Each structure stands twice: as C-alpha cells, then as structure tokens.
Design a protein around this nucleic acid. Structure first.
Ligand SMILES: [Zn+2]
Ligand SMILES: [Zn+2]
Lengths: 82, 148, 109, 95, 88, 99, 110, 93, 83, 99
DNA sequence: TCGGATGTATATATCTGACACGTGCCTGGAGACTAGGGAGTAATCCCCTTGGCGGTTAAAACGCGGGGGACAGCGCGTACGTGCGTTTAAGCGGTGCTAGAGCTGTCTACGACCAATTGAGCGGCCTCGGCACCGGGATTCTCGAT
DNA sequence: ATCGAGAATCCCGGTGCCGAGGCCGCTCAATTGGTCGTAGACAGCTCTAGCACCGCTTAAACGCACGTACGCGCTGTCCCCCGCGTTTTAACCGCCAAGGGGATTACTCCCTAGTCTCCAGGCACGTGTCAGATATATACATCCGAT
C-alpha cells in the first residue's frame, strides 16, 4: 500500500521546473499549492485513461488511451502515435 | 435480508386488514409465490365475478415490483392472454411504501372503469371504445361462465 | 492530365492519394466522397508538411545539426507567430520551451 | 502467425523532406512527431468537412468542402497558400 | 420528546432508522433503503414522490446526506437496536 | 576572500540553461509511484508501461510550464518579482478551468 | 418488456427512442447502431433535462413566477457547482450573469 | 412549406411530469431544445470516436455508458449511468 | 450604398454599463479605446467565419444559424437561436 | 445644499440594477451598423437578418462581461480599483485569445 | 446618535400579447422476415512488465549567513465619479420594393460497388557516420576594490 | 564610470556507437475496367422579410463644472528565500525471471441492416384565456450630513 509520497515532486524538482518558467525568486509555501494542482490534473487525466482502458476489457493502460485522453481534454499531445 | 421481515409484515397487515371485496395470501410454504382471490366490483361489467391471481415476489422486493398474473382467463381491455395487468404501479410507478391494499384499490378502480387508451388486447379495447354496452354483456357472460 | 499511373504521380504530389481516399471512405465522415476530395486534402497536408519541414531544417542548420530533432520542431512551431496560432494547443514531445525572458524580468544596475 | 501490418506516413514525409532538403536527416522521434501531426491535421480537416456537409444537408464531401475547411482552420497566409496549392493539384489531376 | 421504536422504524423495510437521512420535506428513511432507492428506483421521494435527486448530489460531497443529530439521539437512547441491525 | 555570486544572476543562468535543454525534470520513479497511487485509488491491480508513464510525465511538465508562465506574468503585473500563491489560483481562475 | 407497443412506452421513458435511433443512423457516426444505445442515450438526455427543469422551477418559485424564463435557467446553471463546470465555457442568451460582488469592492465600513 | 423537427413537446411533457404547475416560455423552450441537441451531439461524437478506437463498427449501450462517464462530472455521470442501466433493464424485460 | 465611421459609433457609456455588469466600479479613460479594438478583433473573426460558411453555402444572406455555428466552432457557443 | 452622492454608492446601486437585469446594453442601431461595416468590409453587397445580429450582440455582451470580470480580478490583485489597460492585456494573455 | 431624500418594495386594475389546447394529416416510426457478416468466444504464444537485487552517486535535505525585497505608511496631485443643462439620434410606427431564400420537377454525370492483379509499400537485415561523451583550451561575463 | 581574478561557457580535437538510411523479399491494398442506382445541379416559380425611407417623440449621450479617493511615487522596515557547503538517500543503470494478458487466429452464432407494409404522434394552424408588464398609489430601509 502506497500513501503520502507526494514529496516525490520535491523542493528542488519543483524549483527547477519553475526556473524553467523564468522565475527568479519563489515564495517558500507555493510548493503545497503546486503539488495540489499537479494532483488534481493528474487524477483527472488518470480518470480519463483508466476509463478508456475499462471500455476495452483491458487489464493494462497504454500510452494510446492516455494520448486520446489528452486529445479529449484539450491538451493534444504529439510523439506517442495517433 | 430484510425481505423476509417485509413479507411477514405484509402478511400480518393483510391479516389485520383484509382488502374490501378481495383477499390475498401465500399460495403455500413459499413466500415469493402468493395467491390472491378477488371479487369483481358491482360498479363494473364483472358484478360478482371471482378471479384468481398468482404473484411472484422478486429478490429486490419491495423495491422491484412483484409480477402478477391473473390465474383465470379474463376478457378485459387491461387483461392480456396470460392475465397480466397494464397498470402504472406494476412496472413503472412502483413505490415501495405502497402495500397490497393501495395497489388492490388501484386495480379495482381500474377494473370498475376500464381504459382502452393503453390496453394489452387491442380488439376488446377497441370494441369497448366503439360500444361499451355489448362489451358489458360479453364480459358479464364470460365472468359468469368461469368464475362460478 | 490523363494517365494510367498512381494518383500521386499524375497529380504531381508526394503524399498518397489512394490511402487518403480509403481513410476518407472508412473514417465515418460521409456516405459518399468526391474524387477531388482526397487529392485536395493530400495537397493541403503536402503544403503544411513541406513548410514545417523546411523551417525545421533551416532551424537545424542554424544549430549546425543536419539531423532533425524534436527541439528543432518546437522552435519551428513557436518562432513563427502565424503557425504558432495554428498549433497553439498542441504540445511537442521533447520540445522544451522557447528561449525568452521578459524585459522587466532582467535585473537592473 | 504474422504480425498485423501497421500504417505510417514515414516514407512520404521522408520524400518531401529530401525534396525540400537533399542533405537533412530525420530522427525517429521527430519522425513520429510528423506522423502524429499529419494524422491530427487530417482528422481536423476531415471532421470539419463532414460537419460542414451535415450542416448543409449534403451527402458528398466534394473538394469545395475541404476548400472551405482549410480556408477556415488556417490563418490568412497559410489559408491562401494552401488553397492555391490545392487548386493547382486538383486542376493538374483533372487535366 | 423521544419517539418510540415504531416512530423510529423506517417506512419501507419496517426496520429501525440506521444512519437516518432527512429529506427537505422532513421525510426520514433508514440508510440502506435510501442507497438502494436513489440509484435503483425512480429518484423520487418514497412518500411524496418529489424528485430529491438535486438535494442528494448537492449533499453527497459534504456528507450531509445522513442526518447526524437524530442519529446521535437514537444512538444515545436506542443503541441496542442499532447493534442488532448492524449485521443487516 | 570567499566568492559568493549575487542572487539573481545564477538564477538567470539556471533559467537560460533549462530553457536551452529538453531533458525530463521530474524523476520518473517517484512520478510513476504517484501515478500508480491514483491508479490503485481508481482501480486495484492496474498495469502500466514506460511509454505511458513518459507520456503523463511530459504532459505534466508542459502543463506546469504553461501554468508557471501565467503565474509569472501575474506576479510581474502585481509589481513583484516573486510568484505568490494568490498568483497561482488567480492564473488558474482566468484560464477557465476552476472558476 | 413483453409489451409490443411504442418503443418509448416499452422502455417507459418520454423522449422518442425511435427518433434518437434515426438520428444515430443518419448522423454518420458509425456503420452499425446497437438497439440498446438509443434507450441509454434517451434516458441520459431525459435525466439531464428533468434535473435542469427541476432546478429552473425552483429558481422561478424563488422569483414567484409561474413561467420559466432564460434568467431562471441561467441562475440554475450558475448556482449549481457542477452544471457550471459542464457548461461554464458555454453562454446562455438573454440570461444575464449570476449576482456576485467582490468583497474588497464593498464600501468602507463607516 | 416544410415540417420542422423540434423537442418542444417532450421538454414540456417532462416538465409537467416533474412540475405539474409551472409553465414554460418560448425562449426557455428554445434553450432547452438546443441544449438537448448539444448534449446529444457531444455524447454521440464521443461514442463514435470510442467505436472507431477499438476498430469496431457498432454503437452499443456500453459505448454510450463510456461516453457519458467521460463527459459528465462524477456523480452526475453516476446518476446518468444508473438511469441508463434502469432504462435498458426495463427495455429488455 | 456608402457607409463608414463604425467603431466610434459605440458610446463610452455603453462600455460603462458593460463594465458595470462585469462588476468593476472605477473605470479609467484608457479602457474605452482598447475595448473598441477588442470588439474589432472579435467581430472580424466571428463574421469572417460566418461569411466563409455563407459563401460556401451558395447563400449571401448571413443567417443566425451560421453565426451560431461560428460561435460553437470557436468554443463560445451561444444558445436560444436554434441548434 | 444639493444631495451630491459620495463617489461609489450610486455606482454600487447601478451595479446591482444592471446586474439583476438581463436587458441588452449595447445600443441596437449603432451595433447593427458596425456589424454591417465589418461585413461589407469582408464581403460587399452582403445582407443580414435581425436574428443573426441579435446573436452577435448577445455573444459580444457575454464576451465583454467575462473579460471585464477577469479584468476585475487581475486589477484587484494589484491592490487597485482603477482598471488600467495592463489589466486588459494581461487578461487577454492568460486566456491566450490573441495568439 | 441622526431626520428628510432617495430608491426599493408592496397593493391593485387592465389589458395585452403569449402560451396552452383542439384539430388534420401525413410522414416518420413500428412490426415481420431474411441474411450475413460483424462480433463473441476458445486456444496459444510470446513481449514485456512486474519484480528483485546490487553497485554507483547525482542529487535531495539541512544549516546557516545574509541581503534583496514584500510589506506598512504618507502625502499629493490628478483623473474620475456625480450632477446638470444641453443636444442628438435611438427607437417606434408605418409604406413600399424586390431580391433572394426556399420549394419543385428533372436529367445526368459523379460516383457507389465488384472481379484481377500487380507493384508500391512494409517487415526484416545490414552498414557506416552524425552525433554523444570526454578531455582540454580559449573566450565572456561577473563581482569586489577603486 | 574603471580593471583583475574567478568562475562560467563556447569551441576544437579525438574516439566510439547505435540507430538512420539503404537494400532485399513478400503480401495485400491501390489501380483498371466495367456496371447501375441516385445525390445533386438546375431552370423555374412563390412569397418573406430585409433594406430604405420618413416622420415623430423622448430617452440617452455630451460637455462641462466640481470635489475629491486614491494611484502612485516615495520612504522605512524586518523578514524570508538564495547560495553555498556538507550529509544522506533514493534515483539510476545493469542484470535476470516468471508469467500474464496483449495480441493473434480460427470457429460459430445471432443482431442488425435492409426491405416491405401499415399506422398514429407530432407538427402546422387557429383560437381561447390568463400571467404579468405597465401604470399608479402607497409605506419603509437606507445615506449622509449633522450632531
Ligand atoms: Zn429500511
Ligand atoms: Zn417527501
């Protein structure tokens, strides 16, 4: 049972992804908020992928169902077949 | 589960409250299959006619409505070949809080004033719509021949 | 042109025509599909691909690389303003970001 | 058994790239990027054409349908250039 | 004013109120009946036939479907029936 | 005398270096652990592969890059150089998914 | 359902499952259409319409009006926290906007 | 002339079924008709895409269930799929 | 038929009520000019799509159905005008 | 001694009165003329109908109200009440509607 | 704290146009029969995905000194809200024209659809060179002292 | 303004590698050629409403006057992220194993498209009846200057 490992997206990792965005200084408590928004987007896309998988009697989810999940979500992705 | 308690309560209620001009109960040891004996209303083309009904209680009773079929063949616009009834509470408007008393009141009010708008046998409903009184004699004679 | 060859050759195209024609046939778009529809659509994709590939190749030559990489594609998409509008929603695999820092972001002496 | 045959636009986009750049290589990642891009654009244009045809109770997606679709989905410069290219292609095919 | 067991029986399966739910029409029904009703019936009130689906979806997230106050009252005053009905 | 760079300049160096590169910026194993966590919260005994995990990871990075562009724009509009949470939820609200 | 009557009545719904089936066939969505899909689709549509009408009627009763108007529908859609999510990007004609005021914009407490 | 197709009577019927007293207006009826059409188009297009995904050619009830699971939010989709299951069960028997 | 001077026809108090319905209480003078440009771009895009549809449809009378289609395609779908 | 209202109170009354109502705000004839201007710019000798311009004006109303609400948020973010142009461009940038 | 002035809400006629209801009908929906081909199901096989160590190790985590900066506060001139007299045209009704949307009989050519087949296109193999990795050297900011 | 030591970064030479591209064999999808039901252009007729005017009334916009709330420029503060050094830890590559369900193929069966015939449900149309906008006439919460 895996629980409460959201710290995998950690302080330096989120800092670096922010620095990619052009920020210099970031307040020390935005980390929880960005982890929360990352979460909610993640279970949204995972809902879409897993139900796409459910439709096919498939025990595994592949990149194909999730790329169509992104397709419907309005975040069309390239580089994994379509 | 609670279906056995519901059936016990229903049989107790019918013991305390026998329906007017009708009656019902278990056909035997089984609780899902029950028998009902009703008498045709006076304000109907079936004055004094006696009819039998077999009722199957489903697993999800009272939430799933039980299925009822008239044992005796009845020539009625709301009665088909196998004796089923085209009534709203039977399949669509079924409410678990409704007991056998209220549904029996509904069926007696339906039989006393037949409605050919939503029938099961088309020809008899159509002839009832065209002339209710020839239908009255024929239904009276039929309920005389098999209910006596 | 009247000819008995592949439709792409007779039309002077590179993208397949019969394949696009079949995709229109079995893609659930219409009961009946016109003959000029596949060649027209193939030409449209032909122009799009030609332009994107030539821009990506120019960008790669600027980066002294003769083999195209998805970063070059991302730069090709975003450096142009019109095509960026055309492909605003899409995300490029391994694309990175356009190098840009806002003017006020830069520090002062 | 035999592996099911798959489809890609690899060879054709390679021909186009060589025609426009006779000394430029392409990696597999960007190759699949181009395959996905052409599939997405094809789906967009075909869906717009089908929607327009249904919106005009028309049973046939003729060349004019895709003409309107590309004129719409593409901004000005690309729209006119693609329209010109498609008209050239269709007139060459019919001639 | 604590109602007796008969007033504390639900209107469908004649059993006690467990995790009672209060409808806007002040109608109360024991929780399993409500579960097997709202998803497996006509979505209407088992008493006045009113469509209470909107209330259900409004209160599902905040867990305000179950009436906490009367549940606490009946647990304080009639706990043994609740323990008996715990196993159906 | 020990040498310490002025804060902000190395910030710009990091920004330029990362805007120049394209490598993954989130560790794949923690990300797939989170992905499997939501998966098991959604359906027990579900299976993935590396390609799908990469797809979700890159979609995450693209979405967060866009969100951070927007929040940097909001913060600089706010006469600040530091992005605040209020910027984060405001940029989310304007984008049109929470309201 | 052994009743060989009208399919909408056979399913016990109000929306025309026959018309839905026809629209599925002539919509050019797929070559074949299952016989159970129109019933499911009509049920979903009827549920959505019924709940919209219920909430709009509640809004009208709040407004003490016995005739549903687009303002009532706008209030019903925006008041609900997930019908908004379903139709937030959408616009309703002549419906106006939900009555809201920013806290800071309120006058100074004097 | 021509015979225009609309859902006016059905919306009025379901309104009277759910509200026996409150009336309707022409603009509100138009809004309801167009909203039903839009939801129909969304669900049916999603189902068509799902059928195309599995190389299938038939739109059955399961594809509609999947589409309504994708489109509507959580418990709205739950209620919709419950209603669809009840309707298809009543249709079968 | 000659006709000109479009955008300044709109009145500053009209933008005033639009902002008021938006809910903002204090309005700068510079807002009114850029609001006109916003209407410029929005209207030109929408009716460009509409006239494209009409010219495709052999018809030169832009109907409400076509503009509803344009808004729906742009994702700003409007209701109450059919479809 | 005229009863000169303080700046803001009648503004809020006016807010409420136009916010509880749904009547159209942009004047009919000028908007119709402007729409005809841009149409005949795109295509000469083009004819409209009343319902089409009605829908156009409703869409314009909705767009303007949404944009002005977003302007409210981004302006009040800066601890200001006076909406500047910078609010308008920031709001249009976050939505990304100007490409 | 405070009493008029203001707008807002409430009570009542009335008259109005819109909504609900009855009718004709007619075309779309419904019931029956058929065929077949698409979908469900059994069997298999093998690709890869989970799982597991195990060594290495770049990177996460923590402490800490500190300096840039968000935040609190003051004034001040300014553009902005508010009100009024004025002007302007927006809206309402009423007329007239006709140009174009829309419906109708129809002929025809664009294309649905099937047998033959073959070569373009794809799966697998093989080869070398564009580029990754590394070490070293020269070039570009940078920050403390003026 | 300046220069100098110090890191930080682009560049050159070298070496290796694995995958990008070319070549070969083979299967099946595109092409040819023919037939035939039918969407659709198409000329023609009907009739609806959109344009344009025209007069008029009156509500809304304009320009101005005026008092001022605050946007903002500036100042002062302490506080909270940053850089860097030091320590630990799980990431990361490499390897091997089992099996499991993804994928493929062969067999069968029954659901549904297609046609045909039949019928009534819903829409166009007309018309009765009332919900509420409008208009007038009352009473009260509230604003702000005054206390
Ligand atoms: Zn119970
Ligand atoms: Zn009730």
């Amino acid at each position: 049972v895996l629980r409460d490992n959201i710290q995998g997206i950690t302080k330096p990792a989120i800092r670096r992804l922010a620095r990619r965005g052009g920020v210099k200084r970031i307040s020390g408590l935005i980390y929880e908020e960005t982890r929360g928004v990352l979460k909610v987007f993640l279970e949204n896309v995972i809902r879409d992928a897993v139900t796409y998988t459910e439709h096919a009697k498939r025990k595994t989810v592949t990149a194909m169902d999730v790329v169509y999940a992104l397709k419907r979500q309005g975040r069309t992705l390239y580089g994994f077949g379509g | 589960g609670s279906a056995l308690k519901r059936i016990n309560k229903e049989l107790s209620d019918l013991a305390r409250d026998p329906p007017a001009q009708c009656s019902a109960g278990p056909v035997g040891d089984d609780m899902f299959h029950w028998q009902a004996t009703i008498m045709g209303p006076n304000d109907s083309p079936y004055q004094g006619g006696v009819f039998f009904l077999t009722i199957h209680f489903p697993t999800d009773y009272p939430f799933k409505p039980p299925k009822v079929a008239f044992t005796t063949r009845i020539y009625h616009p709301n009665i088909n070949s196998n004796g089923s009834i085209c009534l709203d509470i039977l399949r669509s408007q079924w409410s678990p809080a409704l007991t056998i008393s209220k549904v029996l009141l509904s069926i007696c009010s339906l039989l006393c004033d037949p409605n050919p708008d939503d029938p099961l046998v088309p020809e008899i409903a159509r002839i009832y719509k065209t002339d209710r009184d020839k239908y009255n004699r024929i239904s009276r004679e039929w309920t005389q021949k098999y209910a006596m | 042109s009247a000819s008995a060859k592949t439709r792409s050759s007779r039309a002077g195209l590179q993208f397949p025509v019969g394949r696009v024609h079949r995709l229109l046939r079995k893609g659930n778009y219409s009961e009946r599909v016109g003959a000029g529809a596949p060649v027209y659509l193939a030409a449209v994709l032909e122009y799009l691909t030609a332009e994107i590939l030539e821009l990506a190749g120019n960008a790669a030559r600027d980066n002294k690389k003769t083999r195209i990489i998805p970063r070059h594609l991302q730069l090709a998409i975003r450096n142009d303003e019109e095509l960026n509008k055309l492909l605003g929603r899409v995300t490029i695999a391994q694309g990175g970001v356009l190098p840009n820092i806002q003017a006020v972001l830069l520090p002062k002496k | 058994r035999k592996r099911s045959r798959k489809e890609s636009y690899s060879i054709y986009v390679y021909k186009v790239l060589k025609q426009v750049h006779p000394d430029t290589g392409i990696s597999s990642k960007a190759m699949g990027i181009m395959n996905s891009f052409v599939n997405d654009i094809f789906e967009r244009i075909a869906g717009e054409a089908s929607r327009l045809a249904h919106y005009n109770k028309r049973s046939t997606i003729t060349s004019r349908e895709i003409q309107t679709a590309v004129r719409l989905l593409l901004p000005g410069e690309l729209a006119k250039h693609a329209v010109s290219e498609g008209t050239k292609a269709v007139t060459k095919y019919t001639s | 004013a604590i109602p007796s067991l008969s007033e504390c029986q639900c209107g469908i399966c004649m059993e006690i109120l467990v995790e009672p739910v209060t409808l806007p029409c002040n109608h109360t029904l024991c929780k399993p009946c409500f579960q097997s009703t709202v998803e497996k019936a006509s979505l209407c009130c088992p008493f006045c036939r009113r469509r209470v689906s909107s209330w259900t979806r409004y209160h599902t997230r905040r867990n305000s479907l179950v009436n906490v106050e009367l549940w606490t009252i009946i647990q304080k005053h009639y706990p043994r029936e609740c323990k008996l009905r715990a196993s159906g | 005398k020990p040498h310490r760079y002025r804060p902000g300049t190395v910030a710009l160096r990091e920004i330029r270096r990362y805007q120049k590169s394209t490598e993954l910026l989130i560790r794949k194993l923690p990300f797939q652990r989170l992905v499997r966590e939501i998966a098991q919260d959604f359906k027990t005994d579900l299976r993935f592969q590396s390609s799908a995990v990469m797809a979700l990871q890159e979609a995450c990075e693209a979405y967060l890059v866009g969100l951070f562009e927007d929040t940097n724009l909001c913060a600089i509009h706010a006469k600040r150089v530091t992005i605040m949470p209020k910027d984060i939820q405001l940029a989310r609200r304007i984008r049109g998914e929470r309201a």
